[PDB]
Amino acid sequence: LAQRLEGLGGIFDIPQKETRLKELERRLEDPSLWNDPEAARKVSQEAARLRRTVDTFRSLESDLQGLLELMEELPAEEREALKPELEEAAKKLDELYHQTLLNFPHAEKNAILTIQPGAGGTEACDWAEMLLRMYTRFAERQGFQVEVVDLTPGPEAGIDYAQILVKGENAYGLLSPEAGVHRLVRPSPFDASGRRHTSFAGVEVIPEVDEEVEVVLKPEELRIDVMRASGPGGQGVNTTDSAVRVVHLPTGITVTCQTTRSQIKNKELALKILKARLYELERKKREEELKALRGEVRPIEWGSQIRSYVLDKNYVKDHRTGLMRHDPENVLDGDLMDLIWAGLEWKAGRR
Missing domain, CATH: 3.30.70.1660 (Alpha-Beta Plaits)
Known part of the structure; x- marks a missing residue:
């Protein structure tokens, strides 16, 4: 199956997109639309990584008959110059796989x-x-x-x-x-x-x-509340402590946050989370969309546990x-x- 990782690890389509991230970055009129040139060098790692895939299966397949020397002799001056390249490989394999399983989005x-x-x-x-x-x-x-x-x-x-x-x-x-x-x-x-x-x-x-990719908030679009859980009768020093509930009026989305003492750091967090939930509310919606375009029934949903x-x-x-x-x-x-x-x-x- 690690044989078939190169299967859906796309190695016939990926060897063509590599010599592409470079051409768009070769023209001098590339940084005209700044948001594209910054993700052409980062995506060019996949340009160099594939050779790092074949280069590693050739180095890997050394093992396909590499320990043939050591299983025939045990000391090995030249062979142990190649085995410390195998652990950089054995562990580069897992990596690869687990690395490919982790690239979505965020x-x-x-x-x-x-x-x-x-x-x-x-x-x-x-x-x-x-x-x-x-x-x-x-x-x-x-x-x-x-x-x-x-x-x-x-x-x-x-x-x-x-x-x-x-x-x-x-x-x-x-x-x-x-x-x-x-x-x-x-x-x-x-x-x-x-x-x-x-x-x-x-x-x-x-x-x-990254908050840069997140919208910006209008103070008038929120309703900040400073809450104090509920102290049993004793509400003397319990009249103003440190938790803040941010509400986002346009949506009703609300975020409460009692992490620390500084009521001011909490507003910051509450807002950092809130922003991210709206960002999620968007994507979720921006996908209910592509269903409009040839998507008339239910997609792929799991109801129970x-x-x-x-x-x-x-x-x-x-x-x-x-x-x-x-x-x-x-x-x-x-x-x-x-x-x-x-x-x-x-x-x-x-x-």
């Missing part, structure tokens, strides 16, 4: 992940907090920083809403195939009869883009990818990579 950008319970009652709020812990642990073990933009606790337990900002390379991309509905099956700690409950929570992920975590029977099962894991306790503690790559491939495989 795959590179940080991520804004949001969780809200669905049906199930108290069970669903606990489940939502569980997913939050899962993604927080996921970030943790990946070297990403997490900024709890907001976190609304639930009536009786768990959370009623949560929204985080995961900062790190390809946060969006990696987390992107996780957007969807998640189903939980197990007996509820909240119900005395050991009756299995079924609970749901949905997860969203959009990317935190994308993944199931059924604990009393000890397995986690991704219904799209098909990947089944027997250690839900690990999945639930952050170990998500294998579920992700698989999702990325399932998503790629359909573009």
Whole structure:
């Protein structure tokens, strides 16, 4: 299959677009439309990378009969001058594949992940907090920083809403195939009869883009509110603390943010998120469009849960990818990579 990566890694169409990014950049009247010349050198990496693909499969296929020398002799002065080029290769292969699985759009950008319970009652709020812990642990073990933009606790337990900002390379991309509905099956700690409950929570992920590509906001298009959760009776120093709710009147889109103390840094974040949600509202719409042009029915949508975590029977099962894991306790503690790559491939495989 890594043989067929060169299959949909496009290597017959890509060897022709390379000698193109250069010609448009050769004419002196290129920087006339500035927004095109800046993405012709960046896209020209794909011009040089393909040779880096054949050059690596030739270097790789050395191994197809390279260790023939070492399996015939063990010391190797000349051969170990080629093997340290194989780990730059063995690890250049994974890279390639995982590199190609990550190039969409904004795959590179940080991520804004949001969780809200669905049906199930108290069970669903606990489940939502569980997913939050899962993604927080996921970030943790990946070297990403997490900024709890907001976190609304639930009536009786768990959370009623949560929204985080995961900062790190390809946060969006990696987390992107996780957007969807998640189903939980197990007996509820909240119900005395050991009756299995079924609970749901949905997860969203959009990317935190570059604000330059984002619209600009009219102060008169917003309604800033400074909120103080709700202190039980004691509202003396609780009359003005630090959380701000920005509303975007034209849409009704709203963003709340209690990350820090400085009420002024929070407005900044609330607005950084808000901007990105509008940006998302656009793309979503700019795509409901190409359907107008030869798109009369339903595209490709998955209604029920994308993944199931059924604990009393000890397995986690991704219904799209098909990947089944027997250690839900690990999945639930952050170990998500294998579920992700698989999702990325399932998503790629359909573009």
